[PDB]
Amino acid sequence: DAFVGTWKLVSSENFDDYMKELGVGFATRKMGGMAKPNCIISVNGDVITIKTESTLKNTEISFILGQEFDEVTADDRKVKSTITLDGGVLVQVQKWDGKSTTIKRKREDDKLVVECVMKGVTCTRVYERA
């Protein structure tokens, strides 16, 4: 849809602080901070697929809006995820151990803007079309 495409990371703010707030250890934060991922978003009927690709790590999720699914995150958390579309924004919540984090993906001008929140920490990652 508005989101379908191949997106390349072009800026990031506060991603280390966000990872730290999630309890990610140094080695994984180091590799994650240095990563320059592509994000490939596709849709087929009810099912949306989001691939995140980088030199040192690839991940993928596929989901139906509103239907909770199990996910293993890049930092190896075992979470329950739900994604919904609200006002043109894909809103993802991950829940694990009584905690939650939100990841909001929006389209703004030429950008795919991703806002990641854990407690008081807010990270913004910006992608542009490949």
**Of these, 24, 50, 83, 112, which contacts ligand QLL (CB under 6 A)?**
24
Query: DSSP per residue over 53-90, as a string?
Result: E-SS-EEEEEEETT--EEEE-TT--EEEEEEEEETTEE
Contact mark string toward ligand QLL, 90..129, x via CB under 6 A:
-------------x----------x-x--------x----
| CB of residue 64 to ligand QLL, shortest distance in Å | 19
Please report the sign of the dihedral spanned by the C-alpha atoms of residue 98, residue 119, residue 76, residue 6: positive
Site of tokens 């991603």: 15
How many C-alpha atoms does 96 have within 13 Å on its Cβ side? 18
Contacts with ligand QLL by CB under 6 A: the residue count is: 19
Q: Which residues bind ligand QLL (CB under 6 A)?
A: 19, 22, 24, 28, 31-32, 35, 37, 52, 54, 56-57, 73-75, 103, 114, 116, 125
